[PDB]
Structures are given as structure tokens and as C-alpha cells.
Design a protein around this ligand. Structure first.
Ligand code: NI
Ligand code: ZN
Length: 345
């Protein structure tokens, strides 16, 4: 994937059954180089019958998204509103105030988003612990993907909400997620259960440092405080800004029923088109472990994954060296996960 463009795959049900394996496959095609990729699950596959009964679901801590700034640079302050039901959120989403504007092509709506995101603060029903998958569905069950990440839970007995457990994300028009990499630069999976689309921006992992160097310049105070201020998930930067400053990036629009996959150290951002529900959690492959070792954590806020588990088991030869702190591995982002050798041959 020399261009490092976002890739789209349409697996057969056979190809689909094994998550870890299909991930390895897509990595064998260079999907990881974009930092983000789409998987269109087979026609037959459905994680639930119908989403009719969920109005009673409780959003404990909705966040009003306040966006401060101008000229393609913005800071997003998320304000914890009191709880409300999905019924209540849905009403607000579709209200004439908050309802999505009229458009023909994505292009149109994008401009609109980047012009009006300071006006009319939206609420985002995010960080909702739970899953909309049915118990019997074994295929790509975000609840229980069973990756090597399960070692954290399995060996420590530590449950980390949203990391190894599933989150629900009820979006409305203009609700935004700021440029980020996942916690510990893990992978993540996002399934748009239902509702209007969600557009994604992506910076190649092999250009992530470039984005950091620029973002530091734009928010020098933030960076002077916290080396990894982007982990605050608060920074918005415009596509036209990126063009101005020559940061490579790509766009894709997730439709309802589609999967989006983010790769280690693959910077992503985006916005919801209208009322929708997305389910998410983080996951891992052998390849990640090195990313995990070399990740730049937030120190400035209290409240971090033990890598010792992972280096011991999957890198035993470098265990002592790493503990001695003299492991000077350099990551090559072009390289697919070891597990992909199967499909390279
Ligand atoms: Ni993300
Ligand atoms: Zn911080």
C-alpha cells in the first residue's frame, strides 16, 4: 500500500468467521499503512435482529461538545450533562435545532461541519458501557473478540471499560471525535449498528510523528504541559489545515452496518452525520506489543497497561534487555503483523 490509502474489504462469510485471521489478512494487503480500514460484513451477517427495544437504555453521562477556536484549529471541551434515556437523546438528536442539514454529497456536509462546529453545541451519548450484539453471535463479537489483549484481564483480573469491554456511542449531527490514537496505541474496532453515517479522517502511522510536530506548534501551551496532550481527545484540526501544512491524510465515510478498523499509532478523527449508534472497543495483535512498549502516555492526568505480561510471553528474548531499558527496537510501520505470514506466502 505505497500510497497508504484507506482500504475496503468485502469478506465472504467463511473469510469473516475468524477476526484475528481476517485482520492478519488485511494487514497482508497493506491496509495498516493507511492507519484505518473498512470491512463490509457479508449480507447474511447481523449482530442483532432489530433495535426496537433499546429506547429505555440509559446514557449516564452525556457530554455537551463545546468547540472553541477558528481558522481550522479548535479545542473541544466536553461537558458532562446529567443522565438521560436513549428516548430522550433521540428526541433531541432529531429536533429541528439539532437535526442534520440538507446535502447531496458528503463534500457538502463536510464543509458545513467545519464551518458551523462552534455554533450550536451538540451532545454526544458516548462511553456507554454495553453491547448491542446478541449472545449467540460469535462472529466479530466486539464483546468477546478474544485477542492477545485478553492477557491484561486474564493475568491481572483487571477490567478496563472501553478497552477490553464494549462501549456504545449515540451520535447526532456535528458530534465530533478529536484527533487521537487509541489508548496505548492499540487497535480498535467500530461497528455502526444503525442510524446516519460517520465520516473518518486518517493520518498514516508512518506520518503520525509529523502530525504531532505540527499539533505541538499549534497548541504549544498544551504540549509544554503534557508531552502527549493529544491523548486528551480534545484537538480538532481542519483538512484544509492539513493540506496547508502538507500532512498526508485520507477520508472515508462509514455507513450503518459497516466495520471500521484503526491500526496502532494510526491517528483518526471524524464526525457523526446524524442520530446513530456505534459500538466500539480496543484489541491487539502480536505486532502491537512493540507499539505498547514505546507508547507516549499522558502523565499530566492521573487515572496504563503492564507490558511486562506481553514482553515476557511474546518477546522472551528481549525481556531482560527491555527490563534493563536497553531495548532500542525501531518500529517499521510498513511491516504487517507476524500472523499475516500465512497470507504473504
Ligand atoms: Ni478511536
Ligand atoms: Zn495529559
Amino acid at each position: 500500500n505505497p500510497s497508504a490509502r484507506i482500504m475496503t474489504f468485502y469478506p465472504t462469510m467463511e473469510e469473516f468467521r475468524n477476526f484475528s485471521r481476517y485482520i492478519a489478512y488485511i494487514e497482508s494487503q497493506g491496509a495498516h499503512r493507511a492507519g484505518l480500514a473498512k470491512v463490509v460484513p457479508p449480507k447474511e451477517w447481523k449482530p442483532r435482529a432489530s433495535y426496537d427495544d433499546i429506547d429505555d437504555l440509559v446514557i449516564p453521562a452525556p457530554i455537551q461538545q463545546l468547540v472553541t477556536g477558528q481558522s481550522g484549529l479548535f479545542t473541544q471541551y466536553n461537558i458532562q450533562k446529567k443522565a438521560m434515556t436513549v428516548r430522550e437523546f433521540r428526541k433531541i438528536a432529531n429536533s429541528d435545532k439539532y437535526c442534520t442539514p440538507r446535502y447531496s454529497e458528503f463534500e457538502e456536509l463536510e464543509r458545513k461541519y467545519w464551518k458551523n462546529l462552534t455554533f450550536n453545541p451538540p451532545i454526544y451519548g458516548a462511553d456507554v458501557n454495553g453491547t448491542l450484539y446478541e449472545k449467540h453471535v460469535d462472529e466479530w463479537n466486539i464483546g468477546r473478540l478474544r485477542t492477545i489483549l485478553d492477557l491484561v484481564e486474564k493475568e491481572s483480573g483487571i477490567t478496563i471499560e472501553g478497552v477490553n469491554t464494549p462501549y456504545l456511542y449515540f451520535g447526532m449531527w456535528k458530534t465530533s471525535f478529536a484527533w487521537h490514537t487509541e489508548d496505548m496505541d492499540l487497535y480498535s474496532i467500530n461497528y455502526l449498528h444503525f442510524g446516519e453515517p460517520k465520516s473518518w479522517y486518517s493520518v498514516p502511522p508512518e506520518h503520525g510523528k509529523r502530525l504531532e510536530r505540527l499539533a505541538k506548534g499549534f497548541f504549544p501551551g498544551s504540549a509544554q504541559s503534557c508531552e502527549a496532550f493529544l491523548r486528551h481527545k480534545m484537538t480538532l484540526i481542519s483538512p484544509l489545515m492539513l493540506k496547508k501544512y502538507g500532512i498526508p491524510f485520507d477520508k472515508v465515510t462509514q455507513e450503518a452496518g459497516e466495520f471500521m478498523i484503526t491500526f496502532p499509532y494510526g491517528y483518526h478523527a471524524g464526525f457523526n452525520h446524524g442520530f446513530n449508534c456505534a459500538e466500539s472497543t480496543n484489541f491487539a495483535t502480536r505486532r502491537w506489543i512493540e507499539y505498547g512498549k514505546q507508547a507516549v502516555l499522558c502523565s499530566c492526568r492521573k487515572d496504563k497497561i503492564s507490558m511486562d505480561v506481553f514482553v515476557r510471553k511474546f518477546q522472551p528474548e528481549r525481556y531482560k534487555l527491555w527490563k534493563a531499558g536497553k531495548d532500542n527496537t525501531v518500529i517499521d510501520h510498513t511491516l504487517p503483523t507476524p500472523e499475516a505470514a500465512e497470507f504473504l506466502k
